Amino acid sequence: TTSNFGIVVEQHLRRISFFSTDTLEILNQITLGYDFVDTAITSDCSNVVVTSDFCQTLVQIETQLEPPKVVAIQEGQSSMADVDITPDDQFAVTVTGLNHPFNMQSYSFLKNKFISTIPIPYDAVGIAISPNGNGLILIDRSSANTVRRFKIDADGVLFDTGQEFISGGTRPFNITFTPDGNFAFVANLIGNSIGILETQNPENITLLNAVGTNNLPGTIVVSRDGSTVYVLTESTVDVFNFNQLSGTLSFVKSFGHGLLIDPRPLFGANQMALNKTETKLFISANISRELKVFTISGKVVGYVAGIEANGGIAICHPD
């Protein structure tokens, strides 16, 4: 029972790998022959979820044994890409990938089945569930340069509020909450800016402002105290400080990962994660097909052996 590990998708091998945060070597490689996209992991740290696009199949696996044991394989109504889990670990929620129709789908970890399905707009990418427990869901709408607000209840039933909000810049692509659920950050992919939304009151969401970034911001990682924010770019990681009273993101510095990556074809899937000691960044390079590890200061620390990165990435974080 170790909690120094993570999981990464390799879409072209129709495979996934578990790797150690410590040694930086593979742990277990499960090959199921699906169209894999993104992953989530549980608070508990005990169960994982992987999605698939054209295969429209979600797989669930238990992580605490000799070799990792997959335990459910369900097909959804339609395709799947970004995933988040509710903060209580009871449900997993999925958003559309490339092939239509376009639906949001929730899945019960207890019942090991899907529970609700609702249609989402054509331009929908990225998903984020608030850690409050208030059950607010927000997704990006890339062509309407707006973000839309959804609901999931205690049962897993999904709802469409049809409330949309400016994203700050243009081509909103990925969203990430603060650990307390009071702000959300939207990566605006051509706008080259992060948007910042007031989400403490989900009946009254508002955009406050937007700070700019290097070319082509993909994924937002935020440290567990909420004061440091890391953004994955075509060429760099950017770090900002966040000020939780005034709602202001302040640039600190950037460093270049020297990797080839391209968010677009992974529909909102996080290609970066922080170890449990928020001391190092793990990056999943789409196109260099490498899992590189850096320190948050930019120091490169080394890559993992023989993983052809291609898709989402998640690291173990108990809490």
PDB file of C-alpha atoms in Angstrom:
ATOM      1  CA  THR A   1       0.000   0.000   0.000  1.00  0.00           C
ATOM      2  CA  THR A   2       1.977   2.966  -1.363  1.00  0.00           C
ATOM      3  CA  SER A   3       0.677   6.440  -2.110  1.00  0.00           C
ATOM      4  CA  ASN A   4       3.644   7.564  -4.140  1.00  0.00           C
ATOM      5  CA  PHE A   5       2.337   6.814  -7.585  1.00  0.00           C
ATOM      6  CA  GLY A   6       0.361   8.102 -10.531  1.00  0.00           C
ATOM      7  CA  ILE A   7      -1.407   7.018 -13.694  1.00  0.00           C
ATOM      8  CA  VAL A   8      -0.961   8.150 -17.294  1.00  0.00           C
ATOM      9  CA  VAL A   9      -2.809   7.409 -20.514  1.00  0.00           C
ATOM     10  CA  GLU A  10      -1.093   6.212 -23.692  1.00  0.00           C
ATOM     11  CA  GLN A  11      -3.777   6.598 -26.283  1.00  0.00           C
ATOM     12  CA  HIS A  12      -1.970   5.126 -29.258  1.00  0.00           C
ATOM     13  CA  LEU A  13      -1.050   1.949 -27.404  1.00  0.00           C
ATOM     14  CA  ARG A  14      -4.592   1.790 -26.107  1.00  0.00           C
ATOM     15  CA  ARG A  15      -2.874   1.390 -22.759  1.00  0.00           C
ATOM     16  CA  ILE A  16      -2.349   3.034 -19.338  1.00  0.00           C
ATOM     17  CA  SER A  17       0.649   3.015 -16.976  1.00  0.00           C
ATOM     18  CA  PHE A  18       1.106   3.462 -13.270  1.00  0.00           C
ATOM     19  CA  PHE A  19       4.415   5.039 -12.370  1.00  0.00           C
ATOM     20  CA  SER A  20       6.140   5.900  -9.113  1.00  0.00           C
ATOM     21  CA  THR A  21       6.472   9.523  -8.047  1.00  0.00           C
ATOM     22  CA  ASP A  22       9.747   8.532  -6.278  1.00  0.00           C
ATOM     23  CA  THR A  23      11.937   6.313  -8.441  1.00  0.00           C
ATOM     24  CA  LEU A  24      10.345   7.458 -11.681  1.00  0.00           C
ATOM     25  CA  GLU A  25       9.840   4.031 -13.213  1.00  0.00           C
ATOM     26  CA  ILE A  26       6.809   2.074 -14.392  1.00  0.00           C
ATOM     27  CA  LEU A  27       4.705   0.075 -11.921  1.00  0.00           C
ATOM     28  CA  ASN A  28       2.041  -1.768 -13.898  1.00  0.00           C
ATOM     29  CA  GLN A  29       0.914  -1.473 -17.526  1.00  0.00           C
ATOM     30  CA  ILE A  30      -2.650  -2.400 -18.348  1.00  0.00           C
ATOM     31  CA  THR A  31      -3.470  -2.828 -22.059  1.00  0.00           C
ATOM     32  CA  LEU A  32      -7.204  -3.122 -22.856  1.00  0.00           C
ATOM     33  CA  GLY A  33      -7.420  -1.996 -26.495  1.00  0.00           C
ATOM     34  CA  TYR A  34      -9.548   1.122 -26.042  1.00  0.00           C
ATOM     35  CA  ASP A  35      -9.545   4.668 -27.316  1.00  0.00           C
ATOM     36  CA  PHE A  36      -8.192   6.150 -24.040  1.00  0.00           C
ATOM     37  CA  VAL A  37      -8.312   9.870 -23.213  1.00  0.00           C
ATOM     38  CA  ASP A  38      -8.295  11.085 -19.571  1.00  0.00           C
ATOM     39  CA  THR A  39      -8.189   9.757 -15.961  1.00  0.00           C
ATOM     40  CA  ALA A  40      -9.359  10.708 -12.518  1.00  0.00           C
ATOM     41  CA  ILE A  41      -8.294   9.251  -9.166  1.00  0.00           C
ATOM     42  CA  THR A  42     -10.128   9.016  -5.872  1.00  0.00           C
ATOM     43  CA  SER A  43      -9.609  11.102  -2.639  1.00  0.00           C
ATOM     44  CA  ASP A  44      -9.271   7.787  -0.924  1.00  0.00           C
ATOM     45  CA  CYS A  45      -6.702   7.096  -3.706  1.00  0.00           C
ATOM     46  CA  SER A  46      -8.124   3.586  -4.048  1.00  0.00           C
ATOM     47  CA  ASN A  47      -9.995   3.752  -7.354  1.00  0.00           C
ATOM     48  CA  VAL A  48      -9.138   5.094 -10.771  1.00  0.00           C
ATOM     49  CA  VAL A  49     -11.245   5.957 -13.810  1.00  0.00           C
ATOM     50  CA  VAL A  50     -10.243   5.997 -17.504  1.00  0.00           C
ATOM     51  CA  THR A  51     -12.358   7.267 -20.395  1.00  0.00           C
ATOM     52  CA  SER A  52     -12.492   6.506 -24.104  1.00  0.00           C
ATOM     53  CA  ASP A  53     -13.671   8.517 -27.068  1.00  0.00           C
ATOM     54  CA  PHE A  54     -14.696   6.497 -30.139  1.00  0.00           C
ATOM     55  CA  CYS A  55     -14.926   3.316 -28.071  1.00  0.00           C
ATOM     56  CA  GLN A  56     -17.287   5.236 -25.707  1.00  0.00           C
ATOM     57  CA  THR A  57     -16.251   3.052 -22.782  1.00  0.00           C
ATOM     58  CA  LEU A  58     -15.415   3.910 -19.175  1.00  0.00           C
ATOM     59  CA  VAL A  59     -13.161   1.536 -17.209  1.00  0.00           C
ATOM     60  CA  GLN A  60     -12.747   1.429 -13.388  1.00  0.00           C
ATOM     61  CA  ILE A  61      -9.765  -0.035 -11.586  1.00  0.00           C
ATOM     62  CA  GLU A  62      -8.715  -0.786  -7.958  1.00  0.00           C
ATOM     63  CA  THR A  63      -5.138   0.236  -7.202  1.00  0.00           C
ATOM     64  CA  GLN A  64      -4.207  -1.349  -3.874  1.00  0.00           C
ATOM     65  CA  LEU A  65      -2.937  -4.799  -4.835  1.00  0.00           C
ATOM     66  CA  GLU A  66      -0.225  -7.079  -6.184  1.00  0.00           C
ATOM     67  CA  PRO A  67      -1.010  -6.190  -9.787  1.00  0.00           C
ATOM     68  CA  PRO A  68      -3.796  -3.545 -10.236  1.00  0.00           C
ATOM     69  CA  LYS A  69      -7.228  -5.104 -10.681  1.00  0.00           C
ATOM     70  CA  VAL A  70      -9.725  -3.728 -13.210  1.00  0.00           C
ATOM     71  CA  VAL A  71     -13.251  -4.341 -11.943  1.00  0.00           C
ATOM     72  CA  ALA A  72     -15.815  -2.738 -14.241  1.00  0.00           C
ATOM     73  CA  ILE A  73     -16.161  -1.964 -17.961  1.00  0.00           C
ATOM     74  CA  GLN A  74     -19.271  -0.034 -19.035  1.00  0.00           C
ATOM     75  CA  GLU A  75     -20.275   1.491 -22.391  1.00  0.00           C
ATOM     76  CA  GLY A  76     -21.802   4.934 -22.438  1.00  0.00           C
ATOM     77  CA  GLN A  77     -24.518   6.474 -24.563  1.00  0.00           C
ATOM     78  CA  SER A  78     -21.860   8.518 -26.402  1.00  0.00           C
ATOM     79  CA  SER A  79     -18.144   9.401 -26.442  1.00  0.00           C
ATOM     80  CA  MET A  80     -16.080  10.546 -23.434  1.00  0.00           C
ATOM     81  CA  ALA A  81     -13.026  12.677 -22.638  1.00  0.00           C
ATOM     82  CA  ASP A  82     -12.326  14.932 -19.614  1.00  0.00           C
ATOM     83  CA  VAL A  83     -13.428  13.416 -16.290  1.00  0.00           C
ATOM     84  CA  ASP A  84     -13.837  14.677 -12.808  1.00  0.00           C
ATOM     85  CA  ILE A  85     -15.046  12.900  -9.697  1.00  0.00           C
ATOM     86  CA  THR A  86     -17.397  14.455  -7.182  1.00  0.00           C
ATOM     87  CA  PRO A  87     -15.581  15.450  -4.012  1.00  0.00           C
ATOM     88  CA  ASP A  88     -17.191  12.564  -2.068  1.00  0.00           C
ATOM     89  CA  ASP A  89     -15.818   9.990  -4.519  1.00  0.00           C
ATOM     90  CA  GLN A  90     -19.323   8.645  -5.199  1.00  0.00           C
ATOM     91  CA  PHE A  91     -19.669   9.716  -8.883  1.00  0.00           C
ATOM     92  CA  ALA A  92     -17.529  10.300 -11.955  1.00  0.00           C
ATOM     93  CA  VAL A  93     -18.676  12.802 -14.550  1.00  0.00           C
ATOM     94  CA  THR A  94     -17.702  12.819 -18.200  1.00  0.00           C
ATOM     95  CA  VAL A  95     -17.863  15.256 -21.037  1.00  0.00           C
ATOM     96  CA  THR A  96     -17.954  14.670 -24.789  1.00  0.00           C
ATOM     97  CA  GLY A  97     -15.007  13.877 -27.048  1.00  0.00           C
ATOM     98  CA  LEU A  98     -14.677  14.038 -30.841  1.00  0.00           C
ATOM     99  CA  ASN A  99     -17.578  11.894 -32.052  1.00  0.00           C
ATOM    100  CA  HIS A 100     -21.162  12.879 -31.497  1.00  0.00           C
ATOM    101  CA  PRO A 101     -23.684  13.011 -30.028  1.00  0.00           C
ATOM    102  CA  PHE A 102     -22.450  15.357 -27.328  1.00  0.00           C
ATOM    103  CA  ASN A 103     -23.429  14.370 -23.826  1.00  0.00           C
ATOM    104  CA  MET A 104     -22.471  14.770 -20.231  1.00  0.00           C
ATOM    105  CA  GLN A 105     -22.640  11.488 -18.335  1.00  0.00           C
ATOM    106  CA  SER A 106     -22.430  10.531 -14.650  1.00  0.00           C
ATOM    107  CA  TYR A 107     -21.357   7.152 -13.321  1.00  0.00           C
ATOM    108  CA  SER A 108     -21.949   5.496  -9.893  1.00  0.00           C
ATOM    109  CA  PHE A 109     -18.841   3.953  -8.294  1.00  0.00           C
ATOM    110  CA  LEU A 110     -21.069   2.016  -5.927  1.00  0.00           C
ATOM    111  CA  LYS A 111     -23.407   0.636  -8.581  1.00  0.00           C
ATOM    112  CA  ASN A 112     -20.580   0.486 -11.133  1.00  0.00           C
ATOM    113  CA  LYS A 113     -23.017   1.847 -13.788  1.00  0.00           C
ATOM    114  CA  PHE A 114     -24.095   5.111 -15.484  1.00  0.00           C
ATOM    115  CA  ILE A 115     -26.900   7.074 -13.937  1.00  0.00           C
ATOM    116  CA  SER A 116     -27.664  10.124 -16.021  1.00  0.00           C
ATOM    117  CA  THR A 117     -27.140  11.466 -19.478  1.00  0.00           C
ATOM    118  CA  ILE A 118     -27.827  14.940 -20.795  1.00  0.00           C
ATOM    119  CA  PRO A 119     -26.933  16.707 -24.063  1.00  0.00           C
ATOM    120  CA  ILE A 120     -24.278  19.393 -24.155  1.00  0.00           C
ATOM    121  CA  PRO A 121     -23.475  21.900 -26.926  1.00  0.00           C
ATOM    122  CA  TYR A 122     -21.258  21.141 -29.918  1.00  0.00           C
ATOM    123  CA  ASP A 123     -18.313  23.278 -28.728  1.00  0.00           C
ATOM    124  CA  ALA A 124     -18.113  21.704 -25.276  1.00  0.00           C
ATOM    125  CA  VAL A 125     -14.662  20.797 -23.874  1.00  0.00           C
ATOM    126  CA  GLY A 126     -13.301  20.397 -20.358  1.00  0.00           C
ATOM    127  CA  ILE A 127     -15.095  19.595 -17.114  1.00  0.00           C
ATOM    128  CA  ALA A 128     -14.665  20.636 -13.518  1.00  0.00           C
ATOM    129  CA  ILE A 129     -16.634  19.769 -10.393  1.00  0.00           C
ATOM    130  CA  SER A 130     -16.529  22.062  -7.363  1.00  0.00           C
ATOM    131  CA  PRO A 131     -14.910  20.534  -4.246  1.00  0.00           C
ATOM    132  CA  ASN A 132     -17.452  22.391  -2.016  1.00  0.00           C
ATOM    133  CA  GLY A 133     -19.975  19.635  -2.088  1.00  0.00           C
ATOM    134  CA  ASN A 134     -22.410  22.160  -3.518  1.00  0.00           C
ATOM    135  CA  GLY A 135     -22.263  20.075  -6.678  1.00  0.00           C
ATOM    136  CA  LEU A 136     -21.665  22.812  -9.219  1.00  0.00           C
ATOM    137  CA  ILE A 137     -20.276  21.828 -12.615  1.00  0.00           C
ATOM    138  CA  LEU A 138     -18.770  24.072 -15.243  1.00  0.00           C
ATOM    139  CA  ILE A 139     -17.618  23.300 -18.756  1.00  0.00           C
ATOM    140  CA  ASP A 140     -15.966  25.321 -21.508  1.00  0.00           C
ATOM    141  CA  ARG A 141     -17.725  26.287 -24.747  1.00  0.00           C
ATOM    142  CA  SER A 142     -14.869  26.919 -27.150  1.00  0.00           C
ATOM    143  CA  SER A 143     -16.708  28.691 -29.942  1.00  0.00           C
ATOM    144  CA  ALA A 144     -19.021  30.780 -27.742  1.00  0.00           C
ATOM    145  CA  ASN A 145     -16.003  31.908 -25.662  1.00  0.00           C
ATOM    146  CA  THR A 146     -18.191  31.378 -22.637  1.00  0.00           C
ATOM    147  CA  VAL A 147     -18.418  28.814 -19.822  1.00  0.00           C
ATOM    148  CA  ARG A 148     -21.682  27.036 -18.982  1.00  0.00           C
ATOM    149  CA  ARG A 149     -22.942  25.905 -15.590  1.00  0.00           C
ATOM    150  CA  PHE A 150     -24.338  22.462 -14.785  1.00  0.00           C
ATOM    151  CA  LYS A 151     -25.613  20.564 -11.760  1.00  0.00           C
ATOM    152  CA  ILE A 152     -25.202  17.138 -10.197  1.00  0.00           C
ATOM    153  CA  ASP A 153     -27.279  16.118  -7.208  1.00  0.00           C
ATOM    154  CA  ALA A 154     -26.875  13.560  -4.398  1.00  0.00           C
ATOM    155  CA  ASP A 155     -28.176  10.843  -6.742  1.00  0.00           C
ATOM    156  CA  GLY A 156     -25.933  11.614  -9.714  1.00  0.00           C
ATOM    157  CA  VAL A 157     -28.705  13.103 -11.820  1.00  0.00           C
ATOM    158  CA  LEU A 158     -27.351  15.877 -14.057  1.00  0.00           C
ATOM    159  CA  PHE A 159     -29.051  19.216 -14.788  1.00  0.00           C
ATOM    160  CA  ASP A 160     -28.571  22.036 -17.263  1.00  0.00           C
ATOM    161  CA  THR A 161     -28.933  25.542 -15.845  1.00  0.00           C
ATOM    162  CA  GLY A 162     -28.167  27.110 -19.224  1.00  0.00           C
ATOM    163  CA  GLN A 163     -26.307  29.927 -17.541  1.00  0.00           C
ATOM    164  CA  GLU A 164     -23.186  30.949 -19.459  1.00  0.00           C
ATOM    165  CA  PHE A 165     -20.416  33.391 -18.493  1.00  0.00           C
ATOM    166  CA  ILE A 166     -17.639  35.175 -20.369  1.00  0.00           C
ATOM    167  CA  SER A 167     -14.345  33.275 -20.139  1.00  0.00           C
ATOM    168  CA  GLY A 168     -12.147  36.347 -20.224  1.00  0.00           C
ATOM    169  CA  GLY A 169     -10.284  35.614 -23.428  1.00  0.00           C
ATOM    170  CA  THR A 170     -11.156  33.609 -26.480  1.00  0.00           C
ATOM    171  CA  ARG A 171     -11.392  29.845 -27.065  1.00  0.00           C
ATOM    172  CA  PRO A 172     -11.917  28.679 -23.464  1.00  0.00           C
ATOM    173  CA  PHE A 173     -10.338  25.207 -23.213  1.00  0.00           C
ATOM    174  CA  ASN A 174      -9.751  23.875 -19.663  1.00  0.00           C
ATOM    175  CA  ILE A 175     -11.203  24.790 -16.239  1.00  0.00           C
ATOM    176  CA  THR A 176      -9.844  24.225 -12.741  1.00  0.00           C
ATOM    177  CA  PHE A 177     -11.301  25.185  -9.351  1.00  0.00           C
ATOM    178  CA  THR A 178      -9.483  26.394  -6.298  1.00  0.00           C
ATOM    179  CA  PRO A 179      -9.315  23.708  -3.604  1.00  0.00           C
ATOM    180  CA  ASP A 180     -12.073  25.623  -1.743  1.00  0.00           C
ATOM    181  CA  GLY A 181     -14.414  26.016  -4.727  1.00  0.00           C
ATOM    182  CA  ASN A 182     -14.643  29.793  -4.486  1.00  0.00           C
ATOM    183  CA  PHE A 183     -12.883  30.603  -7.724  1.00  0.00           C
ATOM    184  CA  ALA A 184     -12.522  28.836 -11.036  1.00  0.00           C
ATOM    185  CA  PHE A 185      -9.861  29.430 -13.667  1.00  0.00           C
ATOM    186  CA  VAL A 186     -10.560  29.200 -17.422  1.00  0.00           C
ATOM    187  CA  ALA A 187      -7.659  28.700 -19.812  1.00  0.00           C
ATOM    188  CA  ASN A 188      -8.344  30.742 -22.923  1.00  0.00           C
ATOM    189  CA  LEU A 189      -6.382  29.058 -25.631  1.00  0.00           C
ATOM    190  CA  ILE A 190      -6.134  31.732 -28.296  1.00  0.00           C
ATOM    191  CA  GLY A 191      -6.879  34.616 -25.916  1.00  0.00           C
ATOM    192  CA  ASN A 192      -3.675  33.502 -24.178  1.00  0.00           C
ATOM    193  CA  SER A 193      -5.136  34.362 -20.813  1.00  0.00           C
ATOM    194  CA  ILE A 194      -6.529  32.772 -17.706  1.00  0.00           C
ATOM    195  CA  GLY A 195     -10.020  33.846 -16.734  1.00  0.00           C
ATOM    196  CA  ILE A 196     -10.973  34.022 -13.075  1.00  0.00           C
ATOM    197  CA  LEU A 197     -14.536  33.436 -11.937  1.00  0.00           C
ATOM    198  CA  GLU A 198     -16.306  34.088  -8.650  1.00  0.00           C
ATOM    199  CA  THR A 199     -17.947  30.801  -7.779  1.00  0.00           C
ATOM    200  CA  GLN A 200     -18.473  31.101  -4.046  1.00  0.00           C
ATOM    201  CA  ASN A 201     -22.088  31.871  -4.902  1.00  0.00           C
ATOM    202  CA  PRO A 202     -23.091  29.512  -7.730  1.00  0.00           C
ATOM    203  CA  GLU A 203     -26.421  31.327  -8.176  1.00  0.00           C
ATOM    204  CA  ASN A 204     -24.424  34.478  -8.916  1.00  0.00           C
ATOM    205  CA  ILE A 205     -21.289  33.643 -10.886  1.00  0.00           C
ATOM    206  CA  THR A 206     -19.205  36.485 -12.332  1.00  0.00           C
ATOM    207  CA  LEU A 207     -15.933  36.933 -14.225  1.00  0.00           C
ATOM    208  CA  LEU A 208     -13.557  39.257 -12.348  1.00  0.00           C
ATOM    209  CA  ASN A 209     -10.699  39.571 -14.733  1.00  0.00           C
ATOM    210  CA  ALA A 210      -8.135  37.792 -16.792  1.00  0.00           C
ATOM    211  CA  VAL A 211      -4.395  37.751 -16.834  1.00  0.00           C
ATOM    212  CA  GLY A 212      -2.356  36.790 -19.893  1.00  0.00           C
ATOM    213  CA  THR A 213       0.080  33.952 -20.478  1.00  0.00           C
ATOM    214  CA  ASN A 214       2.642  32.656 -22.929  1.00  0.00           C
ATOM    215  CA  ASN A 215       1.464  31.090 -26.137  1.00  0.00           C
ATOM    216  CA  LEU A 216      -1.320  28.576 -25.883  1.00  0.00           C
ATOM    217  CA  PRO A 217      -2.340  27.708 -22.289  1.00  0.00           C
ATOM    218  CA  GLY A 218      -3.498  24.131 -21.741  1.00  0.00           C
ATOM    219  CA  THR A 219      -3.938  22.955 -18.182  1.00  0.00           C
ATOM    220  CA  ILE A 220      -4.174  24.649 -14.790  1.00  0.00           C
ATOM    221  CA  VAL A 221      -2.745  23.046 -11.665  1.00  0.00           C
ATOM    222  CA  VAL A 222      -3.343  24.762  -8.352  1.00  0.00           C
ATOM    223  CA  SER A 223      -1.523  24.021  -5.068  1.00  0.00           C
ATOM    224  CA  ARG A 224      -3.665  22.865  -2.114  1.00  0.00           C
ATOM    225  CA  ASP A 225      -3.569  26.200  -0.220  1.00  0.00           C
ATOM    226  CA  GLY A 226      -4.717  28.007  -3.344  1.00  0.00           C
ATOM    227  CA  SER A 227      -1.930  30.552  -3.486  1.00  0.00           C
ATOM    228  CA  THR A 228       0.177  29.128  -6.318  1.00  0.00           C
ATOM    229  CA  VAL A 229      -1.008  28.430  -9.882  1.00  0.00           C
ATOM    230  CA  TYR A 230       0.838  26.547 -12.618  1.00  0.00           C
ATOM    231  CA  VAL A 231      -0.119  26.795 -16.262  1.00  0.00           C
ATOM    232  CA  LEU A 232       1.000  24.483 -19.079  1.00  0.00           C
ATOM    233  CA  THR A 233       1.951  26.219 -22.309  1.00  0.00           C
ATOM    234  CA  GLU A 234       3.210  25.346 -25.767  1.00  0.00           C
ATOM    235  CA  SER A 235       6.737  26.206 -24.592  1.00  0.00           C
ATOM    236  CA  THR A 236       6.589  27.012 -20.910  1.00  0.00           C
ATOM    237  CA  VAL A 237       5.183  26.432 -17.518  1.00  0.00           C
ATOM    238  CA  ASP A 238       4.023  29.720 -16.060  1.00  0.00           C
ATOM    239  CA  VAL A 239       3.652  30.181 -12.367  1.00  0.00           C
ATOM    240  CA  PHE A 240       1.355  32.762 -10.799  1.00  0.00           C
ATOM    241  CA  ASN A 241       0.522  33.656  -7.230  1.00  0.00           C
ATOM    242  CA  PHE A 242      -3.124  33.945  -6.319  1.00  0.00           C
ATOM    243  CA  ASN A 243      -4.622  36.335  -3.879  1.00  0.00           C
ATOM    244  CA  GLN A 244      -7.717  34.848  -2.375  1.00  0.00           C
ATOM    245  CA  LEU A 245      -9.264  38.052  -1.050  1.00  0.00           C
ATOM    246  CA  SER A 246      -9.011  40.406  -3.995  1.00  0.00           C
ATOM    247  CA  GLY A 247      -9.211  37.629  -6.574  1.00  0.00           C
ATOM    248  CA  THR A 248      -5.984  38.594  -8.362  1.00  0.00           C
ATOM    249  CA  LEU A 249      -3.446  36.411 -10.223  1.00  0.00           C
ATOM    250  CA  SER A 250       0.107  37.810 -10.180  1.00  0.00           C
ATOM    251  CA  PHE A 251       2.776  36.557 -12.583  1.00  0.00           C
ATOM    252  CA  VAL A 252       5.866  35.187 -10.921  1.00  0.00           C
ATOM    253  CA  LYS A 253       7.926  33.422 -13.550  1.00  0.00           C
ATOM    254  CA  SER A 254       8.052  30.901 -16.361  1.00  0.00           C
ATOM    255  CA  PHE A 255      10.363  28.145 -17.464  1.00  0.00           C
ATOM    256  CA  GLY A 256      10.478  26.178 -20.676  1.00  0.00           C
ATOM    257  CA  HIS A 257       9.748  22.482 -20.656  1.00  0.00           C
ATOM    258  CA  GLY A 258      11.452  21.894 -24.004  1.00  0.00           C
ATOM    259  CA  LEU A 259       8.766  19.393 -24.964  1.00  0.00           C
ATOM    260  CA  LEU A 260       6.519  18.962 -27.967  1.00  0.00           C
ATOM    261  CA  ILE A 261       2.891  18.995 -26.857  1.00  0.00           C
ATOM    262  CA  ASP A 262      -0.528  19.920 -28.356  1.00  0.00           C
ATOM    263  CA  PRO A 263      -3.597  20.044 -26.027  1.00  0.00           C
ATOM    264  CA  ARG A 264      -6.287  20.232 -28.682  1.00  0.00           C
ATOM    265  CA  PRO A 265      -6.824  16.513 -29.521  1.00  0.00           C
ATOM    266  CA  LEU A 266      -7.251  15.523 -25.837  1.00  0.00           C
ATOM    267  CA  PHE A 267     -10.430  17.582 -25.189  1.00  0.00           C
ATOM    268  CA  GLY A 268      -9.726  19.220 -21.817  1.00  0.00           C
ATOM    269  CA  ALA A 269      -7.657  16.455 -20.349  1.00  0.00           C
ATOM    270  CA  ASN A 270      -5.110  17.502 -17.770  1.00  0.00           C
ATOM    271  CA  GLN A 271      -1.622  17.009 -19.105  1.00  0.00           C
ATOM    272  CA  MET A 272       0.119  18.079 -15.875  1.00  0.00           C
ATOM    273  CA  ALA A 273       0.043  17.065 -12.214  1.00  0.00           C
ATOM    274  CA  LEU A 274       1.738  18.016  -8.953  1.00  0.00           C
ATOM    275  CA  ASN A 275       3.238  15.297  -6.705  1.00  0.00           C
ATOM    276  CA  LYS A 276       1.673  15.033  -3.230  1.00  0.00           C
ATOM    277  CA  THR A 277       4.481  17.241  -1.923  1.00  0.00           C
ATOM    278  CA  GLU A 278       3.716  19.952  -4.478  1.00  0.00           C
ATOM    279  CA  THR A 279       7.481  20.004  -5.017  1.00  0.00           C
ATOM    280  CA  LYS A 280       7.606  18.660  -8.575  1.00  0.00           C
ATOM    281  CA  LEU A 281       5.599  18.874 -11.786  1.00  0.00           C
ATOM    282  CA  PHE A 282       4.813  15.877 -13.945  1.00  0.00           C
ATOM    283  CA  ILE A 283       4.132  16.752 -17.610  1.00  0.00           C
ATOM    284  CA  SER A 284       2.522  14.432 -20.191  1.00  0.00           C
ATOM    285  CA  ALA A 285       3.876  15.543 -23.592  1.00  0.00           C
ATOM    286  CA  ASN A 286       1.243  14.731 -26.214  1.00  0.00           C
ATOM    287  CA  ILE A 287       3.669  14.843 -29.154  1.00  0.00           C
ATOM    288  CA  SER A 288       7.123  14.193 -27.707  1.00  0.00           C
ATOM    289  CA  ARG A 289       5.421  11.197 -26.116  1.00  0.00           C
ATOM    290  CA  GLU A 290       7.442  11.659 -22.925  1.00  0.00           C
ATOM    291  CA  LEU A 291       6.639  11.905 -19.229  1.00  0.00           C
ATOM    292  CA  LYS A 292       9.067  14.541 -17.966  1.00  0.00           C
ATOM    293  CA  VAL A 293       9.439  15.622 -14.341  1.00  0.00           C
ATOM    294  CA  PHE A 294      10.506  19.040 -13.166  1.00  0.00           C
ATOM    295  CA  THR A 295      10.812  20.783  -9.877  1.00  0.00           C
ATOM    296  CA  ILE A 296       8.491  23.754  -9.477  1.00  0.00           C
ATOM    297  CA  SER A 297      11.603  25.926  -9.799  1.00  0.00           C
ATOM    298  CA  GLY A 298      12.120  24.649 -13.332  1.00  0.00           C
ATOM    299  CA  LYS A 299      14.890  22.189 -12.555  1.00  0.00           C
ATOM    300  CA  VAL A 300      14.430  19.136 -14.744  1.00  0.00           C
ATOM    301  CA  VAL A 301      14.639  15.987 -12.667  1.00  0.00           C
ATOM    302  CA  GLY A 302      14.336  13.228 -15.277  1.00  0.00           C
ATOM    303  CA  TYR A 303      11.785  11.260 -17.342  1.00  0.00           C
ATOM    304  CA  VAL A 304      10.095   7.881 -16.746  1.00  0.00           C
ATOM    305  CA  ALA A 305      11.409   4.873 -18.629  1.00  0.00           C
ATOM    306  CA  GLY A 306       9.525   3.720 -21.692  1.00  0.00           C
ATOM    307  CA  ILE A 307       6.187   5.520 -21.342  1.00  0.00           C
ATOM    308  CA  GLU A 308       4.913   7.084 -24.552  1.00  0.00           C
ATOM    309  CA  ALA A 309       2.794   9.771 -22.978  1.00  0.00           C
ATOM    310  CA  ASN A 310      -0.436  10.491 -24.791  1.00  0.00           C
ATOM    311  CA  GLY A 311      -3.404  11.702 -22.805  1.00  0.00           C
ATOM    312  CA  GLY A 312      -4.449  12.630 -19.297  1.00  0.00           C
ATOM    313  CA  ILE A 313      -2.430  12.205 -16.124  1.00  0.00           C
ATOM    314  CA  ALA A 314      -3.299  11.961 -12.436  1.00  0.00           C
ATOM    315  CA  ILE A 315      -1.271  11.696  -9.279  1.00  0.00           C
ATOM    316  CA  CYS A 316      -2.191  10.223  -5.904  1.00  0.00           C
ATOM    317  CA  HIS A 317      -3.359  12.862  -3.414  1.00  0.00           C
ATOM    318  CA  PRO A 318      -4.867  11.730  -0.160  1.00  0.00           C
ATOM    319  CA  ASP A 319      -7.062  14.167   1.751  1.00  0.00           C
TER     320      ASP A 319
END
